[PDB]
From a paper:
During translation, a conserved GTPase elongation factor—EF-G in bacteria or eEF2 in eukaryotes—translocates tRNA and mRNA through the ribosome. After peptide bond formation, the pre-translocation ribosome contains peptidyl-tRNA in the A (aminoacyl-tRNA) site and deacyl-tRNA in the P (peptidyl-tRNA) site, which must be translocated with their mRNA codons to the P and E (exit) sites, respectively. Using time-resolved cryo-EM, we visualized GTP-catalyzed translocation without inhibitors, capturing elusive structures of ribosome•EF-G intermediates at near-atomic resolution. The structures visualize how nearly rigid EF-G rectifies inherent and spontaneous ribosomal dynamics into tRNA-mRNA translocation, whereas GTP hydrolysis and Pi release drive EF-G dissociation.
The pre-translocation substrates, obtained without EF-G, feature three conformations of the ribosome and tRNAs: non-rotated Structure I and rotated Structures II-A and II-B. Structure II-B features a rotated ribosome with an A/P* and P/E hybrid-state tRNAs, whose acceptor arms are shifted to the P and E sites on the large subunit, respectively. Structure III reveals EF-G bound to a fully rotated ribosome with A/P* tRNA, similar to pre-translocation Structure II-B captured prior to EF-G binding. Our Structures I through II-B confirm that prior to translocation, the ASL of peptidyl-tRNA remains in the 30S A site, whereas the acceptor arm and elbow spontaneously sample different conformations, including the A/P* state, which is most advanced toward the P site.
Numbering used by the authors:
A (entry chain D): 1 to 46
B (entry chain b): 1 to 271
Amino acid sequence: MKRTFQPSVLKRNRSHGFRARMATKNGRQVLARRRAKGRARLTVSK
Amino acid sequence: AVVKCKPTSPGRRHVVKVVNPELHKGKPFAPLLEKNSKSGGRNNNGRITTRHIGGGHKQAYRIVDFKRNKDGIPAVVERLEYDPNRSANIALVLYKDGERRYILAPKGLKAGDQIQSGVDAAIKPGNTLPMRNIPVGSTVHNVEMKPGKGGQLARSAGTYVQIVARDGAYVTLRLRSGEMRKVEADCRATLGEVGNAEHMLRVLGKAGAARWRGVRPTVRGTAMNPVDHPHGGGEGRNFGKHPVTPWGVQTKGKKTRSNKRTDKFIVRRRS
RNA sequence: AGGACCGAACCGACUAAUGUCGAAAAAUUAGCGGAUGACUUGUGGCUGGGGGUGAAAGGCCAAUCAAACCGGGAGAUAGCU
RNA sequence: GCUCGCCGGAAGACCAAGGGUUCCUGUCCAACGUUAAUCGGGGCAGGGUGAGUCGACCCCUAAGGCGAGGCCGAAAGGCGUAGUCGAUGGGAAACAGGUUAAUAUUCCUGUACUUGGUGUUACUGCGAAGGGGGGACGGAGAAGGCUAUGUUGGCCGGGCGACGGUUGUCCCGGUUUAAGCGUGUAGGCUGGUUUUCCAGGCAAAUCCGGAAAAUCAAGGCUGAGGCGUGAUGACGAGGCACUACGGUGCUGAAGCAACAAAUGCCCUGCUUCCAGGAAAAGCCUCUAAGCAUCAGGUAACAUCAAAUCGUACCCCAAACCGACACAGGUGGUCAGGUAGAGAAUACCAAGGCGCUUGAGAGAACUCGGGUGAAGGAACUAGGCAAAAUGGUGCCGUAACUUCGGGAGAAGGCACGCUGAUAUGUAGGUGAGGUCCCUCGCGGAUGGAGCUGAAAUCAGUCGAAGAUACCAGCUGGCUGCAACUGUUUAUUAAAAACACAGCACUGUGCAAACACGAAAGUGGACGUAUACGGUGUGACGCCUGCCCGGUGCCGGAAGGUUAAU
RNA sequence: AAUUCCUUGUCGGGUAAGUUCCGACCUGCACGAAUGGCGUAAUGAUGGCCAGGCUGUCUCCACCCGAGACUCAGUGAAAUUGAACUCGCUGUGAAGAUGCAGUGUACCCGCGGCAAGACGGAAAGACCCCGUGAACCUUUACUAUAGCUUGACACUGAACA
RNA sequence: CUUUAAUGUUUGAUGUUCUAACGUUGACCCGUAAUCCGGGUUGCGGACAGUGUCUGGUGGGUAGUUUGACUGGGGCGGUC
């Protein structure tokens, strides 16, 4: 039956992209901690 | 025409339709229209600040003239158009110089009548003129509260307002709710009661006929569980409290007017 | 004309059998209900945790809901095992 | 390769979403494939996606997002004006044939088209974020004219047939052709035409609107299909040569008419209903300041430009979502024949597959079925489950009723084929001919040809003629809820929720009320025939007594009492 | 009676037989008028009840068709498990014994079955109680508090009774 | 003294007029091709409203917690 993950690559980037984080204060606070442990795929992109 | 229906199906049995042959079947006048969203009964914050609102049929706003700026220019009524916003019928009116506007339609105003605004206009149903020239003891509508702001009182269909007394600067208006308030005498008002007097006789028959008006179902407070409503609870049909709102303010008689800023303008309340 | 009637697509889930380390963390099979409407569906928006939304069951909110999920107070406390 | 079998409104064919090389070819079989494997969506090496017209990008905006200033907030921040983003929407243009192992409306052949730039020529007032027109719109129904397309005939080739017959009222195949350009039809909408004036369109206006006067009764707009050209081309069965025996090369006939017919097109029409059915640009027209020598405006002709990205492949699945090559999930388009009302169902075409373990045996038992003597609910918590009923036409129908219903109530009779009626009728279709012509895609008449129900009668076969698949069990009495609906995704679909209707009550607008420290939004661009809250629940009859208690409302004689 | 405990009340009908059903009686433990009363045509995957037709539901099962089971080949799990040379009975025992005592019986080992036992497997019982454990919900429990409201001073001035 | 009417005075309570604080989610003008907002004229209100500090009342709207033990299982009963 219909599972809980229907992907839509426009909809993924608008709410977990790069500029979706950088537009808010707490979103930039994520990428400070994402860089600290050295995440390779730093956000979800491509 | 208060026309009861034939019961060829359930739901159709109790319907009454107010068919009016006076209305115009055609499409409305275009450049006086604009868009109008529905908003679902939610504010800019996003939370639902008014329950049961939503759904309904898509409708377009008709720009209507309440202020009646054109003083002295005579005007002729073209037709009558259904408006899904008002409960009253509106009329497309063409002026002597060329402008087309909308007005709220009075009672005995068929298409083919002559109206104007201004102080020298005759006291005949349809004209609008400042309140200090209207004779005491006359029925008006579209009453402004502040001079040249609006036209606010007596706008829903079949209503009117009785001018009673003039003490120099103010004038007393026995409102539709049995309330006598005073207003500034410089305001304008339009003679005659508003048309479509049989709007009250619409009964809707079925359940979906209130949905496409935009009114969602309401759930009684005694139906819910007591985390939701302050009635709630129950091991089967228990009320046991005094009837309050969903936010715990008593609903079966509790005077909630608290202004003290417009109390100087009234005489009586709801009796 | 109709929240009209019979009936596929479509939407739904009343019954029985099967399955229960399944084909499947809810399905198949034989029927069954709605099927021009308060229908259903696509893509995109909006509303968030004592808050949301709710034709109201305390249901649903990413297989989690009488107060989500992740990190932190935190090695909480544990007269108990 | 030969048979056999299954799907065939899919188990076919295209796409979007989403994947990411899975596509093709050569190559190897450790792992992976629930078995083997020479095979593969596996490993490995190479190859493969070509655009002025498709799509994105782009110009335009909806919901909504960000938001210079600004308003507000201990802080972070919240809201929002100017704006500026955001498609699922609106906006310029291409089709047919061919070609690869893999791509194509992208390459090639042929035929077109669109908006720009640049030039020259011809003439002229051009000119905005501004005005206006346009763009630009619902639901339902009825048609009518058509096409896609099918079937038959004609025609063209090919056959005369493994066993009885078959040169004919015989059998098999084919009979295809676009965009464009030219024509303006079926039909739809609208009275045109020139001149004067005006306080309306935040300025101006020759445009829009308005007021008339005269003039003619027509003009204009939209418009499927048809027919022409496109195209004496292209394709084309079938032959010819070669075949690495894969397929390639080469010539290559007919290419018409009739009828049927869409849910597609005309139609964003038309009638009609109320629940009253987006915006902005491209487009067209008007002018402002401004330039009016020029510039710019259209028309003509020549040339130039149309960049960038995506393009393979799967796409109802072994490639996407479900941990799996999982009996699950997933939006749109195309939709042939025979019977059928039908996209149901059954059998088939195009096309695609036989579901990645088989071979034996024919015990109990279990699952899925088929049949059954006599009995027919005796079973059981209970007719659960099965069996049964099932189509169409006519006849026939009860209590009750809100006069619609009940009702397909219940129940009956007739259904096959053949012939006659009638070398196939009623009906539809419509050629030749003839008459009009304002002379056309005309009208009138004409009836060939084609198509063709259904009914009656006469036979006639079988046990059974709605034969298969497909397809209501019915009645009676009562409980509850008026009704269709909604609900516990995953043990509860109900009498629960809703509901129209009724009542009490709040609210006079800067409304009550809700979200928010606030600004401000919703309520509502509404105004008491309105909005909010509550309780009951269609409709009919009605809705009794009690105001001490508790709340609400009103009152003021007195008691009592906060900071101060 | 969706309400009636006593109760299967009493009477009438229905059946050979009716704790259900229909109709009344009133003795209403403990119905009752918008937390609505009594009706009510139509509607319902609604509850109860009866009838016709129909039948493997049954008396009582029989046969047949396929799919597993079964044999062979290929791959190849799982939950559970202190160790086991893992018999019946009477008794005894932390009180229901494969394991102790007495006694009986029993060649060693497969295969197909069935499911009485191994207090079989699964899930640190959900019932019950305990904890000076938790969460929610209610209220005239207690203390608070947003909110709404009263008054004093401030922003805040003149006149006049 | 009990009473009362007038005077004088002190403490407050109302009510009426004014406008210059303040309100304006009235109109119009400008910032500006802008329904925010600021500025300007005018009108209507007007020392009210509204807000701050303090204070009485209300307050399951919301929150933190309490709700004993013995007991022939617990509850109820009875007891400490």
